[PDB]
Amino acid sequence: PQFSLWKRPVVTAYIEGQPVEVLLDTGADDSIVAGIELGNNYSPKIVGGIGGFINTKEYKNVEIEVLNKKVRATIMTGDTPINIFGRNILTALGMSLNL
Amino acid sequence: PQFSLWKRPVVTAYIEGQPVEVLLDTGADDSIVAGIELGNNYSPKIVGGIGGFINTKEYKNVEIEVLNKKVRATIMTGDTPINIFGRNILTALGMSLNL
Numbered sequence A, B: 001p002q003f004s005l006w007k008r009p010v011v012t013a014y015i016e017g018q019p020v021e022v023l024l025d026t027g028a029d030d031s032i033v034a035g036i037e038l039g040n041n042y043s044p045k046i047v048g049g050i051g052g053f054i055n056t057k058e059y060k061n062v063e064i065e066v067l068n069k070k071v072r073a074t075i076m077t078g079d080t081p082i083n084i085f086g087r088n089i090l091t092a093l094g095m096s097l098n099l
């Protein structure tokens, strides 16, 4: 369905079990969710945004149900001010920007 | 006019006649470019990205042209790795997110 961008494109996701609220972010390459501890094996990862860098931990192949689709996804866990679903998941989902 | 998110959604915009490459970013509440000088009529403004907080210069009602549409929007200039068109412009453009 359509999101006009007059408010933040935030939805309730399920990393599953866990409902998190997420920003749908065409300017993020990757996805970063705060406030979650996730699984056995992550890689160290370093992410560049505006005004600096952040150290996240990388969990691949995760249960994500959002927008009544289910996806297995790679999501990082870092100290982010807002949870972000970036391009890596937005493509999976088949979302686009129009017009 | 219908960007698949497989690559970074970058277009060429003209800011007051000047061509610039900008990333169309649904997760940005506002817009910030580097490499253009817009004048002395600005306000100082602090902005928070995922890495931390930066100083910017805020101009109001600057003329923007993107794919056949001419709008007037608020735009910040500053030191940014990449030029961003946030929600304040994407909305002015009548752009949406598609599923």
Ligand SMILES: CC(C)(C)NC(=O)[C@@H]1CN(Cc2cccnc2)CCN1C[C@@H](O)C[C@@H](Cc1ccccc1)C(=O)N[C@H]1c2ccccc2C[C@H]1O
Residues within 6 Å of the ligand: A025, A026, A027, A028, A029, A030, A031, A032, A047, A048, A049, A050, A081, A082, A084, A086, B025, B027, B028, B029, B030, B031, B032, B047, B048, B049, B050, B081, B082, B084, B086
């Ligand atoms: C107005 C301004 C432009 C400062 N907004 C942002 O930076 C916000 C900030 N919030 C938070 C906020 C903080 C404080 C107050 N209000 C809001 C989190 C989300 N972003 C929007 C992001 O889309 C910004 C992009 C910008 C960029 C693109 C490429 C390279 C560098 C910078 C961004 O952060 N992208 C990076 C990124 C981000 C997440 C995950 C992976 C990756 C990789 C990479 O593309």
